[PDB]
Write a protein that binds this DNA or RNA. Structure first.
Lengths: 73, 74, 90, 96, 103, 80, 109, 89, 77, 95, 91, 103, 95, 78
DNA sequence: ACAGGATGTATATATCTGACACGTGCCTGGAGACTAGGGAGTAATCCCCTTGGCGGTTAAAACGCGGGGGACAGCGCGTACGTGCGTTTAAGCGGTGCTAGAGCTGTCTACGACCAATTGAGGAATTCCCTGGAGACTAGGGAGTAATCCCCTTGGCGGTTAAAACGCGGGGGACAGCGCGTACGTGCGTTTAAGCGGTGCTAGAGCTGTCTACGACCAATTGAGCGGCCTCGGCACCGGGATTCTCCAG
DNA sequence: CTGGAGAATCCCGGTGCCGAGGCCGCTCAATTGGTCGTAGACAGCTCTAGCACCGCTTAAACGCACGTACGCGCTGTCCCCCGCGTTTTAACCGCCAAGGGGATTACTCCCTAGTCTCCAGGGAATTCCTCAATTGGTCGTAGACAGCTCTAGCACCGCTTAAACGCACGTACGCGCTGTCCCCCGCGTTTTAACCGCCAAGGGGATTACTCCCTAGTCTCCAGGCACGTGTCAGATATATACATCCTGT
C-alpha cells in the first residue's frame, strides 16, 4: 500500500545508523513493509476511536498521541 | 529526506483503510514520526541478530524474530 | 536461597551509611531474579536460533544488548567485558 | 464555611498520591476473592500472602486504569469521568 | 579462592553457574557465561541501589524502603523503560497531577 | 460465602482509588463499572492461580502461584 | 581331498547343503556356487543369533544358552524379530513389559 | 542328521566360554531348517518365474534380498559373495 | 473337558499377557477361543496322521499342522 | 495387613512375565486334547511330545491374544478386559 | 499362449447357458484356477515329501484337497475327484 | 478317446499332467493325480461361475463382471474363507453400514 | 437449505460402496509410484498395467484398513476415526 | 512431493467406501504415511524381480509376484 | 410434533460404439504303444513306548466374604468437522513422434549330471569326571500401607472506633443550540518517479571436512552462607503550637 | 482587589517497639584436579542472490482552485456532583479452638543376594562302522552372447471439464467432570485333583526282504487349441419423469 522503493530506501537509511555495508534479503524488506503497514492501520483505528470520543470526525495529532500514550508506547 | 518517501496519499490510504473519514493536515508529519520510530525499534534488533550470526545480510528470519520480540514487548 | 548478602555488599559500597528494609530486600531479590531469568531466556532463544548447544559470553552480551535500553546496555556490556577479561587474565 | 467544590478533591488527590497504603479494606476484599475462588474449587484455601498479592495487583491495575480514563476524559475537554471513558481506555488497551 | 573474587565481583559466579545449569536454558554453559551475567546483575543492582539511596536521602531517611525503590525506578526514565510492566509492592504512585485539573 | 461481596468494594474506596489515579470528579455510574472491571480482572487471575495450585496438586494457592499467574498474564509483581 | 567347506572357508557343510538342494527337488539343476552361497548365509545368520543369545545369557549371569535367551535375543533385535515374526520359541517366555497406564506412579510436579 | 556340531563350532567362534542347552540346540536346528526352506523355496520360485532350470548363486542372492530384512540382507549377501569368490579362487 | 482349563490358569495366562484386571465373562470366552484353536490344529494333525496310514499322532504332525496354520513352532524338530 | 487392589496383580504380572514354565495343568489339557481328537478319529494315540507341542502352541496363542485384548481395553479407556475386547481383537486379526 | 479360458467358458455354458463373461472376469477366473492349482500341487508335493515317497498319487491330491478346502466344499471336491478317478480307471 | 472325455471332464487332464510333471512337484506323478486334480478344479470353477451367474442375474446383467465375482466370493462364507487373503481387480466391497452410524 | 451433518456422508458411503471405480486420480498416483521407484533404481520403466496393479492393491489395502479403523472407533464409542484408531488397527494386524 | 497429489478428497472417498462416517483432520497425513510405507514395500520387491530379470521395465507380473510374496494375491493381471 | 416442499436417485428410452462370439487354418501337443527299472507294497519279527492302575502327599483350586475402585451413565461446553459456494487448477483425452528395450532366433561352449571308486567324517555307544544350576536357608533392604504429630488457617466471639451511609442545598459542570470562518475534500491538469524487464557482476551464504580445546562428569576437601539468637537504634506516633492556605467581605 | 479569619498542615520533642544488624556454628555447596569425548572453530569451495545500471511506460503524485462542511467559540439552562453533618454499621484487633494437611515414622511383607549341598548331565574321550562326500571322466543340453525387429513406453501440446482448493458458518460430537452401584480383588479356609513314581502289558511302528506293477522314456500320428478376422449384440451414455426422504416452518 506504500510504494515499494521509497520504503526500501527508508529501511536502508535507518539501518545504516546501526551497521555499515549491511545487506537485506528481498523478503526482509517486504516483511518490514507489511508489518509497518499493519501497525499503522491498527494505530489509525485507535486514532479514529479517540476522535469519535471527542464528538469529532476529523482525526488530529492529539488523537494519535493519546492512542500511543494509552497503548503505553 | 527519505521519510518524505512515505507520501501524503499513501498515509491517506492507510488511514481510510483504518476507517478514518477525514484527516487533518498535521497528521502526515505525526504519522511519519511514529512510523520512523517503529522501524528503528525493529530494524535495530534485527541488526543485533545478524551481528550475532556474524552475517552481513539481514534475513527475513531476523526480521520476524525482531518483530515477535517487539510484539511481545508491545 | 537469597541474594540479600550480596545486595548488602553492593549497598555498603554505593551508600556506606544507608541500610535497607527486608520488605525492600525482597523486592531486590525479585528484581535480580526477574532480570536473571529473562536474560537467560533470551540467551537460550539466541543459542537455539543459531543452532548452538552452548551458552557463552557472546550469547549473554547480545541478550543484554536486546533486553536493556541503549545506555544501560552500553554500560552493562562494559562491566561484563571487564569482568570476563579479568577472570580470564587471573 | 464551605470549601469551594474541587479544592478538597485536589487535597484528597495530593494525600493519596503521597501515601502508599492500601485503599481497599482488607476483609471485604478477602471475602470477594474467596467468593470468586469458591466457584472454581469448592474447598480451596489461600495463603494470606496470596490475598495480599492479589490486592496489590488489583489496586495497581485499577489505579493505572483510572489514570488512562482521566486521560480520556481530559481529551474530551471535560473533567468528570464517565463510563464511556473506562470503555474507551480498555478498548484502546485492547483488554476487552 | 572463589571465582567471584577472581573476577572481582561481589555477586556469586558459582551460584549463577548452578542456576544456569539447573534451568536447562541450554545443554552446555560456557565458563564465561556466569561471569558476564553476574557482572551485569551486579551492575544493575548497584545502579538501582544508587538511585534508591538518593531518593531515601532526599526523604531524609537512613533506610531504603519500597517507596524509595518506586521513586528511583520511575524518576529514572531508563530503568522506567526496563521496568515498565513491573508493579512494586506498596510502591505507591509517582506524585503527578496536570495543570488542566489545577485551578 | 455471601453471594454479593462485590458490594464490599465500597463507593468511598473506589473514590480513593480514583484520587490516587488523579481524578478530580467522577460520575455516579463509574462505581458499578469499576466493580465490573474489577471482578473480571480478579476472576481470571484466580483461575490461573488455581491452575498452578492444581498443577502442583496442592490444597492451597500460595503467593508464588499468584505471582506466576500475574507474570504469565504479563504483569510482574515484585516483593512476593 | 579337501572339503568344499574348508575350500570356501565355512563351518557349515557345503556338501550336505548341496545334497539337500538336489534331494528337495527345488529345480532340475543346482549350480556349483549355490551351495556355497547358501551355506555362507546360513552360517552368518546362525552366528548373529548365537552372538545375541550369548549376550543375553551373559547379562543374566548364566554360562549356558537356553531357549529364554534365544527368545530375548530374537525379540530384542528388531531385524530378527521381523524375520521371526510368525515363529514361537518353545519354552521361551515373553519380554517383560507393562503399559504405563497400568502403573500407579505419578509425577505430581 | 542335524546341524548341532556346526552350530556348536560357530558358538565356539562367537562365544568360546559359553555353552548351549540341548533344547536351545534343537531350536537352532529348527531355525536353520526353516531359513533353508525359505531361501531354497524362493530360489526355486524365482528360477521358475524366469523359465530357468538351474538354481545358481544369483537366485540365492536375490532370494536372500527378498527374504532377509534389509540390514541382515546387506551382510548376508556380502558373506555369500565372499564365500563364492574364495571357493572359485 | 474344557472345564479342565480353570479360572486360575486363565488368570495366569492373562498376567503373562500383561492384563491387570479381568472381568468374570472372560473365562468362558477364552475357553471358547481355546477350543476353536485346538480343533483347528488337531484336525490337521489327524489329517497328517491318517495320510501316513498311522494311528499314533506324532509331534511332527503337530509341527506340520502349525506350520500350515501359519504359526511355526521351534523346539520339536 | 492387606495390599490394595492391583498391587498383587502387578506383582503377578512381573512374576509371570519373568518366568517361562507352562501355566495350564498338564493332565486337564491332555484330557481336553483327547476329547477334541475323539471326534475326528477314534482310538488315536498321542506322543507325549505331541501333547507338549500342542500345549506350547496353545499357551503362546492365548498370551499373544491377551496382549491384543489388553490393547483394545486400554484403547476403550479402561483397564478391565471385556469379552468385547477379545471379539474386537479376533475380528481385527481376521480370525 | 497358456490359458484355461475355453474350459471356463465350457463350464459357464454348462451351468448358465444364457450368461456370458467379460474378458476381465475371464482373466480373473484364469488367475483363480492357476492359484488353486498351485496351492493343491504345492501341498501335495510337501505331503509326498513328508512321507519320504517319490510320487504324487490321487491320495496325495485327496489329502491336499481335504487340508486346503473348508467343510462341505472339501467334501464335494473329494466326492467329485474320486468319482472322476473311478470313471477314468473303470473305462 | 481323450482322457478328459474318458473321465467325463471339461478341464484338460493332459495339460494338468504336463503342468504337474514340468512343475518339480515330485519326481513322479501317478496317472490318477491329474484326473483327480482336474475334477477338483472343474468343481470349484463351476461353483464360482454358478454364484457369479446368480449375482449377475440379480443385477439384471447378462454377463459376469468382476463385481459379480466379488459378490459371489464374498457372499458365500466358504469361498470367502478360501479367498480371504485374495483381492479381485475391479471388484468392489459388500454394501454394509454399522447400525451405530445409521440414524 | 442445508443437509444435516452426516446425511451426505451416509449418501456417499452408499454411493462408493455401490460402485467399483478407482478413487485416487491416476496421474498423481503414477507420479508417486515413479518417485518411490526412483529411490530403488534409476531410469526405470513401468508397464501401464504395473501402475494399475499397484493402484488396485493400494486402494484395496486402504479400504480394508479403514474398515478395521472404523471398528476401532466404534469400540471406543466414537463415530469419528482418529489416528490412534489406525495405529491400533495396524498394531493388532501385526504391522 | 507427489504424495501431496493424493488429495484429501480421495482419502475421504476411500474412507467412505470403507464405511467411515466422520474423519478427523489428522487422518490424512496418517493415511499418506501408511500408503507410502505400503507402496515402497511392494515396489522394493517388484524392482528386485526386474533386476533379477535384468530388465529395465517393471511388468505387472513383477508386481503380482511382489504382492503375493507380501501375502496378498491380486487376481486380474495374469 | 406434523406437514409440505425441495433435492437426489432410480427408471425408461434411444443410439452408438466397443467388446464378445464364432469360424477357419495351421502348428504343436497329447495320445498310444512298448520297454525297462525301481519304487511301492506286503509279510514277518522285534522292540519300545504308550496306556492304565495304584498309592500318597502336597499344592492348587474352590468357596466364601468384605470393601474399594472402576465402570457406566448423565450433563455441559467448546471446537472441530461437515455442507455449501465460487474460483482456480490439473487431470483426462486425443494426437504426434521417436527411441529404447523387449522379445525372438541361432550358434557354440562350458557347466552340470551321471557313474564309479575310495576315503574320511560323523554318528553311536560307553565311561568317567567336573561343573553349573537348583534348592534351601538366612539376612537385609525396599516398598507398601497406615498412623502420628505439628502447625497453620478458618471459625467463632467480644467490643470499640472509624468509616460509610444517607440526606440536603448549592454551585459548578455537562449538554445543547447557534453562528461563522477555515480547512479539508474534490476536480483537473501536468509532471515525475515507481514499476517492470533485462544485463552484468561479485561477495556473501551455505555446506563439508578435520582437529583441538573446552566443558562435563566424578571425587574429595574446605570455606562460605545460612539459620538462630541477641541488642540497640531508628522510625512512627502522639501532643501542642505556629504557620500557611483558602474564602468571604469591604 | 485586599485584608482578615478560620481551617488544615507541618514541625518539634519525647517515648516505645520492632526490625535490622551482627555473631556463632554447622552443613552443603563451591572449588580443585583429572579424564574423556564432542562441539565448535577453521579452512576451503561453490553458487545463489543481492546490488548496480539502463530504458520505457503509465499510473500516481503534486499543485492549485473552488466550495461547503465541520470545528470551535459563545451562551444558556438544567442536572448532578460535592461537601458537610449525623447516624449506622462493619472493619479491625485480640483471643481461642478445631480441623486439615503435610510430613514423618513405623511395621510388615516380599524380593534378592549369598552360601552350601546335591544332582545330573554334559562334555570329553575312545572305538567302530557305514554312508556320504570327494575325485575323475564323459556326454549332452542349457544358457550366454550376438543379431534383428517391432511394440510400447515416454515426451509433448492443446484443450475442456470436472474436481479440488479456499472460505464461511453452524451444529453436533468429543471430552471432561461427577456420582453411584456393582463387581472384582485380596485373603482365609477347606477340599480335590494333580503330580511323582513305579509296574505291567500289549499294540504299533520300524526294519528287512522279495516281488510285481507302474511310470518314465521314446517314437509317431492326428486332432485340438490358439490366433486372427468379421459380424452382431449388449452395454454405456444421455435425457426426462417420477418417487422417496429429509429439512424447515408453524
Amino acid at each position: 500500500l506504500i510504494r515499494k522503493l521509497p520504503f526500501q530506501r527508508l529501511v536502508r537509511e535507518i539501518a545504516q545508523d546501526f551497521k555499515t555495508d549491511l545487506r537485506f534479503q528481498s523478503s526482509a524488506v517486504m516483511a518490514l513493509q507489511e508489518a509497518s503497514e499493519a501497525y499503522l492501520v491498527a494505530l489509525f483505528e485507535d486514532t479514529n476511536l479517540c476522535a469519535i470520543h471527542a464528538k469529532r470526525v476529523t482525526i488530529m495529532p492529539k488523537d494519535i498521541q493519546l492512542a500511543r500514550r494509552i497503548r503505553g508506547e | 529526506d527519505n521519510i518524505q518517501g512515505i507520501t501524503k496519499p499513501a498515509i491517506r490510504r492507510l488511514a481510510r483503510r483504518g476507517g478514518v473519514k477525514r484527516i487533518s493536515g498535521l497528521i502526515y508529519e505525526e504519522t511519519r514520526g511514529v512510523l520512523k520510530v517503529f522501524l528503528e525499534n525493529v530494524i535495530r534488533d534485527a541488526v543485533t541478530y545478524t551481528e550475532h550470526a556474524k552475517r552481513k545480510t539481514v534475513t527475513a528470519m531476523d526480521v520476524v524474530y525482531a518483530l515477535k520480540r517487539q510484539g511481545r514487548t508491545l | 536461597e537469597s541474594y540479600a548478602i550480596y545486595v548488602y555488599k553492593v549497598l555498603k559500597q554505593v551508600h556506606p551509611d544507608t541500610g535497607i528494609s527486608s520488605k525492600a530486600m525482597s523486592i531486590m531479590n525479585s528484581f535480580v531474579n526477574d532480570v536473571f531469568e529473562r536474560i537467560a531466556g533470551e540467551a537460550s532463544r539466541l543459542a537455539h536460533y543459531n543452532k548452538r548447544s552452548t551458552i557463552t559470553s557472546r550469547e549473554i552480551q547480545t541478550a543484554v544488548r536486546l533486553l536493556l535500553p541503549g545506555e544501560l546496555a552500553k554500560h552493562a556490556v562494559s562491566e561484563g567485558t571487564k569482568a570476563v577479561t579479568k577472570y580470564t587474565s587471573a | 464555611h464551605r470549601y469551594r467544590p474541587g479544592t478538597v478533591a485536589l487535597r484528597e488527590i495530593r494525600r493519596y498520591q503521597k501515601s502508599t497504603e492500601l485503599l481497599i479494606r482488607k476483609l471485604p476484599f478477602q471475602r470477594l476473592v474467596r467468593e470468586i475462588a469458591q466457584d472454581f474449587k469448592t474447598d480451596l484455601r489461600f495463603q494470606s500472602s496470596a490475598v495480599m498479592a492479589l490486592q496489590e495487583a488489583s489496586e495497581a491495575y485499577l489505579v493505572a486504569l483510572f489514570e488512562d480514563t482521566n486521560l480520556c476524559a481530559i481529551h474530551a475537554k471535560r473533567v468528570t469521568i464517565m463510563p464511556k471513558d473506562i470503555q474507551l481506555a480498555r478498548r484502546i488497551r485492547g483488554e476487552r | 579462592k572463589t571465582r567471584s573474587s577472581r573476577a572481582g565481583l561481589q555477586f556469586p559466579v558459582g551460584r549463577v553457574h548452578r542456576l544456569l545449569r539447573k534451568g536447562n536454558y541450554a545443554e552446555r554453559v560456557g565458563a564465561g557465561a556466569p561471569v558476564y551475567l553476574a557482572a551485569v546483575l551486579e551492575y544493575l543492582t548497584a545502579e538501582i541501589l544508587e538511585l534508591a539511596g538518593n531518593a531515601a536521602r532526599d526523604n531524609k531517611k537512613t533506610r531504603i524502603i519500597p517507596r524509595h525503590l518506586q521513586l528511583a525506578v520511575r524518576n529514572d526514565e531508563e530503568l522506567n523503560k526496563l521496568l515498565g510492566r513491573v508493579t512494586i509492592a506498596q510502591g505507591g504512585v509517582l506524585p503527578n497531577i496536570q495543570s488542566v485539573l489545577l485551578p
